From a paper:
Bone morphogenetic proteins (BMPs) are secreted multifunctional signaling proteins that belong to the TGF-β (Transforming Growth Factor β) superfamily.
Using the software Phaser for the molecular replacement and an iterative search procedure, four Fab AbD1556:BMPR-IAEC complexes were found in the asymmetric unit. As expected from other antigen-antibody structures the complementary determining region (CDR) 3 of the heavy chain contributes, by far, the most to the buried surface area (570 Å2), as the CDR3 of the variable heavy chain domain (VH) is in the centre of the antibody-antigen interface. In the case of BMPR-IA, the interfacial residues of the AbD1556:BMPR-IAEC complex are almost evenly distributed over the slightly concave site of the three-stranded β-sheet, which consists of the β-strands β3, β4 and β5, but the Fab-binding epitope also involves several residues from the β1β2-loops as well as the β4β5-loops. Structural analysis showed that the β4β5-loop of BMPR-IA does not adopt an α-helical conformation as seen in the complex BMP-2:BMPR-IAEC, but rather exhibits an extended conformation similar but not identical to the NMR structure of BMPR-IA. However, in the structure of BMPR-IA bound to the Fab AbD1556 the β4β5-loop adopts a rather different conformation, which resembles a mixture of the conformation(s) found in the NMR structure ensemble and the BMP-2 bound form. Surprisingly, despite the differences in the structural epitopes of BMPR-IA for Fab- and BMP-2 binding, the same residues in BMPR-IA seem to be involved in recognition and binding to BMP-2 and AbD1556.
Residue numbers in the entry:
A (entry chain H): 1 to 135, 143 to 193, 200 to 220
B (entry chain L): 2 to 211
C (entry chain A): 34 to 118
The structure:
């Protein structure tokens, strides 16, 4: 009953390095090729690296060649990935995966991944800009903050109906932005609260 | 060397779903398919172009010829909603390559086009030497859109930043996309546009400088 | 396509039984899973263009042995053995 468990992920600055491990069990480990495969939050699968069963053949994705070194220790039952010169592009959930061939290779078993997140972000309050209505919809652009979460109320709780605050993007920089938009007809303010950084901005939005 | 899948595909309950995967001479390569549900590891569903691992339902089959490989899910169910990725062996560095994956929606409600609101950069942000266009997409189903920005009808590659879709309180989907510009870039074009494509159908909103 | 192969374990459902046509090669394979269980299979290996690989698959699992040949029905006479350990 194969098992594969990644560990060692987490936070790092750009230029940093982490080492990921993944512990195998339920199979004679040194009989199989292992892979690293990753996935940036809500994007697609990207293959990173393989080592042959005996550890002697090794292979990489152009996007990581020279910065990541895969390896294994058939003594322990442990596969490694040394990630150096990290970049924002490297943030992704990392999976180790077992290769198995019938006629040709497939990955039959995967760990459940560790998240690696690369960012020199470390608490910064957001800048708020008003989304001026055209002639009606209007909003607040709450921009460039970190880390989650941020609350927006309108006219200190009074304005409740017709509001749609949107979930945030995780930008390349490693910072977030979100928007709250309210639908009205015809005096309006957003109360952006970012507890993580003692920031309370009220921005009166107008025409 | 490069696999192409449509971003999203949807079917009515019970109907057959076909998910395609295409690239140069794909049919001379063996294709492998994974299903992936929110919060978990991908799962092998088809392995030489068309073998089912024991324990994946007969409902799933795959075929491959020409430039096109296809995952076919006959009489499909709610439980089949997931992302599917194709893949094959590349000789670069001796690894594997994945399609961009496709989201299979099993229609649990009537299909609904998104509402798009587009805001230009505020004059306040412009004075701080920055510029962001905010494109708010909402009330759509299934929860899959492809977003394209235009300056004067030329595509805009850089500085776009899009969220994945999230369920709204009413079970339709929302998403946002932000385009970062230089103030001089903003003023230098005649207009910018946010183009949202949903279920093969496009809705477009557009803004202009002062 | 112009080659006929024996098949079992996983035959394409365009089988007149235990026969697939291909333009590539015939194969037989043996593999043992994570318990001592060994399963046989044979069938058609599709033509892969410039690429080809039968014995030389350094990335393939150890407990697997596959053999290929390119003559009408050549794989009936085919008896791959797992290495000994």
């Amino acid at each position: 009953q194969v098992q594969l468990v990644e560990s060692g992920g987490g936070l790092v600055q750009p230029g940093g390095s982490l080492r990921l491990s993944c512990a195998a069990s339920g199979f004679t480990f040194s009989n199989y090729t292992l892979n690293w495969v990753r996935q940036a939050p809500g994007k697609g699968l990207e293959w990173v690296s393989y080592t042959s069963s005996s550890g002697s053949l090794t292979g990489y994705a152009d996007s990581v060649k020279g910065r990541f070194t895969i390896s294994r220790d058939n003594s322990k039952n442990t596969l490694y990935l040394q990630m150096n010169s990290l970049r924002a592009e490297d943030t992704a959930v990392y999976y180790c995966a077992r290769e198995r061939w019938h006629v040709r290779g497939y990955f039959d078993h995967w760990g459940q991944g560790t998240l690696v997140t690369v960012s020199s972000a470390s608490t910064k309050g957001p800048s708020v800009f008003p989304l001026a209505p055209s002639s009606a919809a209007l909003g607040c652009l709450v921009k460039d903050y970190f880390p989650e979460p941020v609350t927006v109320s309108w006219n200190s709780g009074a304005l409740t109906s017709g509001v749609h605050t949107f979930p945030a993007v995780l930008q390349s920089s490693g910072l977030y932005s979100l928007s709250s938009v309210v639908t009205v007809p015809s005096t309006y303010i957003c109360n952006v609260n970012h507890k993580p950084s003692n920031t309370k901005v009220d921005k009166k939005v107008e025409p | 060397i490069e696999l192409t899948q449509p971003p999203s595909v949807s079917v009515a309950p019970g109907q057959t779903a076909r998910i395609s995967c295409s690239g140069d001479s794909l049919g001379s390569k063996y294709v492998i398919w994974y299903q992936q549900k929110p919060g978990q590891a991908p799962v092998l569903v088809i392995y030489d172009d068309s073998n089912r691992p024991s324990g994946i339902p007969e409902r799933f089959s795959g075929s491959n010829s020409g430039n096109t490989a296809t995952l076919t899910i006959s009489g499909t169910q709610a439980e089949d909603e997931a992302d599917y990725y194709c893949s094959t062996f590349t000789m670069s560095g001796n690894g594997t390559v994945f399609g961009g994956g496709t989201k299979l929606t099993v229609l649990g409600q009537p299909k609904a086009a998104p509402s798009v609101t587009l805001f230009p950069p505020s004059s306040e942000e412009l004075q701080a030497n920055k510029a962001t266009l905010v494109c708010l997409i909402s009330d759509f189903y299934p929860g899959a859109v492809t977003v394209a920005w235009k300056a004067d009808s030329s595509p805009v590659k850089a500085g776009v930043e899009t969220t994945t879709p999230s369920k709204q309180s009413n079970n339709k989907y929302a998403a946002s996309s932000y385009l970062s510009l230089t103030p001089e870039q903003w003023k230098s074009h005649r207009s910018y546009s946010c183009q949202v494509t949903h279920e093969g159908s496009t809705v477009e909103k557009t803004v202009a400088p002062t | 396509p112009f080659l006929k192969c024996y098949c079992s374990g996983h035959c394409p459902d365009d089988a007149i039984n235990n026969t697939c046509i291909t333009n590539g090669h015939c194969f037989a394979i043996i593999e043992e899973d994570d318990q001592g269980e060994t399963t046989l299979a044979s069938g058609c290996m599709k033509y892969e263009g410039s690429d080809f690989q039968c014995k030389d698959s350094p990335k393939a699992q150890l407990r697997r042995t596959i053999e290929c040949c390119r003559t009408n029905l050549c794989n009936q006479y085919l008896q791959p053995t797992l290495p000994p350990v």
